[PDB]
Amino acid sequence: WVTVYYGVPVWKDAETTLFCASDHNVWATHACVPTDPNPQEIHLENVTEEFNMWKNNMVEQMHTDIISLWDQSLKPCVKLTPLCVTLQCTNVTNNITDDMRGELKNCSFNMTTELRDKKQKVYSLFYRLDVVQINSNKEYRLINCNTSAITQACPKVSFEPIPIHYCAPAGFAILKCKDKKFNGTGPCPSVSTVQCTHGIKPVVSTQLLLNGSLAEEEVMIRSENITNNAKNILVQFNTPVQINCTRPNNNTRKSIRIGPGQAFYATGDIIGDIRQAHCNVSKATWNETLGKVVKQLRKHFGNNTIIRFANSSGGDLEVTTHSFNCGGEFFYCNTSGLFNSTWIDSITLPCRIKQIINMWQRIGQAMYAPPIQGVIRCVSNITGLILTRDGSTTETFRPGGGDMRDNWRSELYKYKVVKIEPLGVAPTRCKR
């Protein structure tokens, strides 16, 4: 009566190590497995599987992998310890517009040279957000000097978010939920087995999610607990909103030798006029998009509820603004022009630029972003929002963010990792 089968199509929830695969990067370079040009996907008929995007450890793994890869790409680069000196700074007033009056500072300092016996007097431009006035009214220091060592990113390694595919090790499988109108939790039909995830771009941003995937039919609202005001709401658009960002300043770069085989990349004089960095969002598109978002929020809050949008709360620049990295430079844009309405050309968002960046939410590891020559222009898709609900007839929504896991959870919500358990027994009617 007892019979033993091996190769039985049974699985259990599991947590394992996934490996990266992909078709001068910060992240995946040669330490990444080449992908399968014709990957498989198998539809599972009559299979219902429970998914929970808020308990998905693929998110934790991706967070750890991208931070570790980030650090490994800075480890061999030039230390800028010799740069933490007293700076003598004045204002840049040459062909400066009103929007940036006081934003750039012209600083001179005594830097080391290839030879230990000699110093050189050099100057460079810094943004006001990179420096601290000390004491002598022209004396400044870089912002990180009392907190951390700073290194210069190697200007050969780009920050372009080249996609990574996560693949399961043998004995494991990745299940994908294809059920449209899947809100991140509970069971879903239409489950398929895949070898690897689709390519997910490690785009780093706050408030607005850029260059991600789109919802299949309608705008979707996902949250761990929609009635808990301490939780974030991830909003996935079913259409992109195009955003055009720029730094309209023709910059030049100069190399300062600071030691035997090391150089600092400094910003030289700006060619032409000096103007403020900004992003343009089409107003009509934004308005239609916001339309769809409210229609869906009402499904959870009432169709007779007043829904208001408001700008972010105060706090650190890295959280209160829309942070992104494009063209190799780090932008901090003011989104109060996008979130200012009751219910529901172009909208111009002014932006600030920084050179000294404290990544993720760490303290102790700062990096200096070498300046980029020429003029930067970026075109990207807003594919979703991170909102926080401020809270009896109205609700207020504000932009949120800063926890990078929310930016990956939004792409990995469809995937689950399971472990295959090939043995099983059953009654039959035979006897050895």
């Binding site: 019979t3 033993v4 190769g7 699985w11 008929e45 043998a170 099983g424």
Partner: protein, 121 residues
């Protein structure tokens, strides 16, 4: 037809014809260690199942007929329900609590016949 786990939603007797489909899918130094650990584990898991089939007398087989009777207390169902209505995922849940008992019995009956076969030679 469908490949790996394609039969997962099929009934137990519709499935169990695809056993080779699943059996074949079981097969900077920090990234090196992570990948090796994943590969070493796949090997170790594979070998534990093979050792277990071996001690039960099922080495080299995907379908092994044993000499242990089925206890109706493990699952009081007939063959029609088990093989024609249920899927393997459902079955695994139904008898989860009896798996270790069954495994112990399978080992014991093999030890007994392994010895009887020596006495007959």
């Amino acid at each position: 037809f469908l490949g790996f786990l394609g039969a997962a939603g099929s009934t137990m007797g519709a499935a169990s014809m695809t056993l080779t489909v699943q059996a074949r899918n079981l097969l900077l130094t920090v990234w090196g260690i992570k990948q090796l650990q994943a590969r070493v584990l796949a090997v170790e898991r594979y070998l534990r199942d093979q050792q277990l089939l071996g001690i039960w007398g099922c080495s080299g087989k995907l379908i092994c007929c044993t000499n242990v009777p089925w206890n109706s207390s493990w699952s009081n169902r007939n063959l029609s329900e088990i093989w024609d209505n249920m899927t393997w995922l459902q079955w695994d849940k139904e008898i989860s609590n009896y798996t270790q008992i069954i495994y112990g019995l399978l080992e014991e009956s093999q030890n007994q016949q392994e010895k009887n076969e020596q006495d007959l030679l």
